[PDB]
Write an enzyme that holds these catalytic residues in place. Sequence first.
Site, PDB file in Angstrom:
ATOM      1  N   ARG A   1      52.018  45.394  33.110  1.00 38.29           N
ATOM      2  CA  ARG A   1      52.452  45.863  31.778  1.00 38.29           C
ATOM      3  C   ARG A   1      53.842  45.372  31.420  1.00 38.29           C
ATOM      4  O   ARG A   1      54.774  45.482  32.211  1.00 38.29           O
ATOM      5  CB  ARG A   1      52.389  47.374  31.585  1.00 38.29           C
ATOM      6  CG  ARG A   1      51.043  48.004  31.965  1.00 38.29           C
ATOM      7  CD  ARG A   1      51.147  49.520  32.086  1.00 38.29           C
ATOM      8  NE  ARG A   1      49.874  50.186  32.009  1.00 38.29           N
ATOM      9  CZ  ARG A   1      49.179  50.617  33.060  1.00 38.29           C
ATOM     10  NH1 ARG A   1      49.625  50.476  34.306  1.00 38.29           N
ATOM     11  NH2 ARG A   1      48.019  51.217  32.859  1.00 38.29           N
TER      12      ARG A   1
ATOM     13  N   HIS B   1      48.063  43.450  30.749  1.00 31.56           N
ATOM     14  CA  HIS B   1      47.141  42.391  31.095  1.00 31.56           C
ATOM     15  C   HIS B   1      46.906  41.238  30.082  1.00 31.56           C
ATOM     16  O   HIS B   1      45.781  40.694  29.963  1.00 31.56           O
ATOM     17  CB  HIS B   1      45.828  43.017  31.638  1.00 31.56           C
ATOM     18  CG  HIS B   1      45.960  43.739  32.944  1.00 31.56           C
ATOM     19  ND1 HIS B   1      46.956  43.411  33.857  1.00 31.56           N
ATOM     20  CD2 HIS B   1      45.202  44.776  33.465  1.00 31.56           C
ATOM     21  CE1 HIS B   1      46.745  44.198  34.924  1.00 31.56           C
ATOM     22  NE2 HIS B   1      45.708  45.048  34.711  1.00 31.56           N
TER      23      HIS B   1
ATOM     24  N   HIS C   1      41.744  40.633  39.664  1.00 29.81           N
ATOM     25  CA  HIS C   1      41.574  42.080  39.695  1.00 29.81           C
ATOM     26  C   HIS C   1      40.410  42.574  40.545  1.00 29.81           C
ATOM     27  O   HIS C   1      39.672  43.500  40.179  1.00 29.81           O
ATOM     28  CB  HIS C   1      41.401  42.617  38.276  1.00 29.81           C
ATOM     29  CG  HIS C   1      41.955  43.997  38.027  1.00 29.81           C
ATOM     30  ND1 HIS C   1      41.382  45.134  38.619  1.00 29.81           N
ATOM     31  CD2 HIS C   1      42.924  44.426  37.121  1.00 29.81           C
ATOM     32  CE1 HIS C   1      42.031  46.206  38.093  1.00 29.81           C
ATOM     33  NE2 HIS C   1      42.967  45.802  37.206  1.00 29.81           N
TER      34      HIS C   1
ATOM     35  N   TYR D   1      38.320  44.733  43.117  1.00 32.72           N
ATOM     36  CA  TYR D   1      38.426  46.092  43.707  1.00 32.72           C
ATOM     37  C   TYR D   1      37.513  46.060  44.967  1.00 32.72           C
ATOM     38  O   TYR D   1      36.378  45.637  44.928  1.00 32.72           O
ATOM     39  CB  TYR D   1      37.853  47.262  42.847  1.00 32.72           C
ATOM     40  CG  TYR D   1      38.650  47.785  41.664  1.00 32.72           C
ATOM     41  CD1 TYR D   1      38.656  47.075  40.454  1.00 32.72           C
ATOM     42  CD2 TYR D   1      39.410  48.958  41.748  1.00 32.72           C
ATOM     43  CE1 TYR D   1      39.327  47.558  39.341  1.00 32.72           C
ATOM     44  CE2 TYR D   1      40.149  49.413  40.654  1.00 32.72           C
ATOM     45  CZ  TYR D   1      40.101  48.711  39.449  1.00 32.72           C
ATOM     46  OH  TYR D   1      40.803  49.150  38.346  1.00 32.72           O
TER      47      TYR D   1
ATOM     48  N   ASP E   1      49.434  53.219  42.283  1.00 33.68           N
ATOM     49  CA  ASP E   1      49.390  52.359  41.118  1.00 33.68           C
ATOM     50  C   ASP E   1      50.705  51.616  41.006  1.00 33.68           C
ATOM     51  O   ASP E   1      51.300  51.579  39.960  1.00 33.68           O
ATOM     52  CB  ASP E   1      49.178  53.164  39.806  1.00 33.68           C
ATOM     53  CG  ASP E   1      48.559  52.299  38.774  1.00 33.68           C
ATOM     54  OD1 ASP E   1      48.362  51.108  38.939  1.00 33.68           O
ATOM     55  OD2 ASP E   1      48.178  52.971  37.710  1.00 33.68           O
TER      56      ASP E   1
ATOM     57  N   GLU F   1      46.409  43.284  43.874  1.00 34.09           N
ATOM     58  CA  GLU F   1      46.772  42.240  42.881  1.00 34.09           C
ATOM     59  C   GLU F   1      48.020  41.486  43.191  1.00 34.09           C
ATOM     60  O   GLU F   1      49.126  41.970  42.894  1.00 34.09           O
ATOM     61  CB  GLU F   1      46.737  42.670  41.378  1.00 34.09           C
ATOM     62  CG  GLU F   1      45.534  43.583  40.984  1.00 34.09           C
ATOM     63  CD  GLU F   1      45.841  44.608  39.931  1.00 34.09           C
ATOM     64  OE1 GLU F   1      46.513  44.344  38.933  1.00 34.09           O
ATOM     65  OE2 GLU F   1      45.333  45.804  40.218  1.00 34.09           O
TER      66      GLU F   1
END
Lengths: 338, 338
Positions: B70, B95, B169, B171, B242, B303
């Site tokens: 961000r 993003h 990205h 996961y 995060d 990431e």
Amino acid sequence: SIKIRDFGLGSDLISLTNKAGVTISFTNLGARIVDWQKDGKHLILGFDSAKEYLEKDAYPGATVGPTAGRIKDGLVKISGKDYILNQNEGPQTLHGGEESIHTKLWTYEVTDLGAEVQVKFSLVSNDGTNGYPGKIEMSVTHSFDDDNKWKIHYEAISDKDTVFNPTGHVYFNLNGDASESVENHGLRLAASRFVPLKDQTEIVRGDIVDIKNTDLDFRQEKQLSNAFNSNMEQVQLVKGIDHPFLLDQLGLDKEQARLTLDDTSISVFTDQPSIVIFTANFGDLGTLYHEKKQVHHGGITFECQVSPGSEQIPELGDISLKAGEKYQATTIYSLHTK
Amino acid sequence: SIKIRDFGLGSDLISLTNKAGVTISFTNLGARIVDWQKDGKHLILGFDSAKEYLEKDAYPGATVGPTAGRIKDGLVKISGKDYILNQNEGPQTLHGGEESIHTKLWTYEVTDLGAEVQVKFSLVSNDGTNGYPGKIEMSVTHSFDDDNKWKIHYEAISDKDTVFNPTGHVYFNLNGDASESVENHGLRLAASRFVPLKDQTEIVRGDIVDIKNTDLDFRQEKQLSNAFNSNMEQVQLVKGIDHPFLLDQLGLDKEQARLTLDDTSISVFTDQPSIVIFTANFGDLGTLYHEKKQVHHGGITFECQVSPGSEQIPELGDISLKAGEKYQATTIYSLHTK
């Protein structure tokens, strides 16, 4: 029948065949029509793979935009403010700028309605893409009906006041041979006015011109030769035809032009106010289409839109796209064999 | 073995099988990874069609950019001037902005080297896209080895001075089930510091933090639940993890992160300086993956990029990219089963 095949570089090829056995194919690479046959006959200009378009000529048959044609100095006045879009051809913006929508892979959905199949291509033009305010959610539908009708339907929405005037970039060639001049075909067009080009620069000049006398009169059906072997300073300039024709009657109802060769003919119908007619004045370029070197005047377009020039000749119309307003256009290519 | 399939909406599914029988698969939509199985069990999160991605969540396994993370107020300063980028999340630029690179169908070319199969994805970021000065020409290469090595090689070159800092990205979920929390995974991370968020805004604070004496300390292998359970301000803030974690030593040679469940383990190599870790703190959202409702903490990402926040904390590095220079980045996910 409907058949999906891999076109190359990650692209798809959607080919439709009607009950008349007429085939037709599109690719998501630029939302274009790749071919259109009739008895092993190509009625259009096209390559055999995605790579070909990316390496030889990326415009043929594509959906071109956001703004089709050239824009002097790439300048546009939106809601007052002056905006400069991507300068593609010298200082001009040619068909949306560099690496525009014709070069992008659109997503798509097919809808088989029986007598008609529709292939809906979608692509999002991000805010600021190539100087274009936005975002512009665009969609282009390519359908083929059981009674030989090639229809293109445009739809668009933008978060911001913008400009929008896209078109379909097909080239026709009933000879089916790229090495054969579109010279022999007869043309009919419901245009009495035309927009002259100032230079080799190819920008508009500011005039609107009563084509009445002049060889550029196809109101009455007449061979392409007449315009080709002609001497107006305009034809000499472009070395053929690279002009925007203005139509007399507006409306989707009307035949606006007719491209005929012998028993086979292709009729035009639009929603638009103009048809830019470009007769592949490539000279010795000789692009290969199916291993067959194209000849000067190897084909012809009928780009239906709002005439290019608006910026200089507002009389032409208003290409703006209000935020939130839903843009729509419809053009039709109907093949006949009577 | 290499296999291509339509994945939906015009996208493709490219599946690579190694000598070991381990399969991995990617899509041109977002140049992403769709799956990775071993013994009939998934190691990552992903869907079974293109529509799921556009419908439920378009981030998973995708290439994200032009700038991963961000950007406060969408503000970046280029070559002296200040530029405002697409504001995607409140006044933020998350993003790459709206409808970015992960939303696009890239072109691709497959290179088969036997023991290695490369899939090179390409895309042009047009000058001005989402406010990014440009043209940015990018390619993202995804490869898969006979020794279970998945690699992402990125490349880029801009016509103008810009900023560039994408990421992958993916996961992971070693349980092979979204309904099972990743709490049960072991993590090892070569990071001593971490950048704290300031609010539910998730913007950066300006602070670099020593994570010794904290539950966020992963130098010595520990169970994920140790962190999830923590009552650490930050942890509580995000409702899990995060944050960007600043790797101590730099270099492609080093294993910077190891994620383990039973006999299976993923090792992470990169040339980048930080690793953004996000444990899908989705609360009750229940996104369906393979028909399974994902649980809070139902995944974890790795990431690899330059830490987000450099804008306010220049110490984090420089994200700029000068016209002409070749940007490059390499990150690797390796599967061991020992």
